[PDB]
Write a protein that binds this ligand. Sequence first.
Ligand SMILES: [Mn+2]
Ligand SMILES: [Mn+2]
Length: 354
Amino acid sequence: LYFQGAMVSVPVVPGADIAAEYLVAAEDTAAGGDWFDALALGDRLVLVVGDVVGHGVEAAAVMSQLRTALRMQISAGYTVVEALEAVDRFHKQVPGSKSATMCVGSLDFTSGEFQYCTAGHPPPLLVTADASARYVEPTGAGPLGSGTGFPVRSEVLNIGDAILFYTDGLIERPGRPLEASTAEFADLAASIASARPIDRLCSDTLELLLRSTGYNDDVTLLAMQRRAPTPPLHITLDATINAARTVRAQLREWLAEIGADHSDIADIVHAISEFVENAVEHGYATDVSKGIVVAAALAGDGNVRASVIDRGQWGLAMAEALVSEARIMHGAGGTTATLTHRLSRPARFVTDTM
Ligand SMILES: [Mn+2]
Ligand SMILES: [Mn+2]
């Protein structure tokens, strides 16, 4: 979810929790030379952090183009390497884009394989399940317009393992030398690791690191922890007056496990509750036993898809106005009401200590 091509929010997926927090060096401006991105592409999750030189009203403009450029290639299904190379060739047409740096990674949901490239960009922190932090190795890539190419490495992340993409603003803090400030970020991430766990890992790291020391560049932190997927939801109920109350309760449990934001929860629970109520009241089978089937699942593209199937009734404008997409189908002996809703959690935009 974007506002003006800018990511104001992070997606939600079965096999990873993602959080994002950022600060902008300037005053009264929504963006600088930094950006982050997280694209849920089905069989994988692609993470992006980037830094454009000299922020800078001019630096935002450059960032905006690069972001749109990288997103277009990634979402068209090119690999990390191919995408980065498309962008590097594109930079010629984007003045000020030379020496922009990026860190891009792709998580395979099945294997935990996380293929990443550090294009002249400080390397990701890995916080493991047993609260060991350590930096992943730099891939050997350099920034845009460096002719270094874009070589890529891999790390296997287990369930509970997290990884932290960040910009140099996080570790180049006022009155702090690089190797000390690097080692403090790592230790603190370790410390905090012994909401969702990735939220506080992301939130608390950044706010203690900057608590006293302040900041002087753009700062962007994009964290994701691998998790075991919540199984899909399935309920088979009697077409009774309490059916909706039953479904709502369980749908709430489920969406909490999934890790959805309250707005998405409110939307989706509203839609499905109304489908169930409509099924009950409208409502023409005199056999009410197991007359209602509800199913809901989160896919790796960040959409929840749900269906309410009943034994036929004598919801569109309602549901179409609440969730990304809704549909109703009728046949003899049945009605199916469906919804598809994209999940998002907002990024945290902070302004504290200069
Ligand atoms: Mn910059
Ligand atoms: Mn910077």
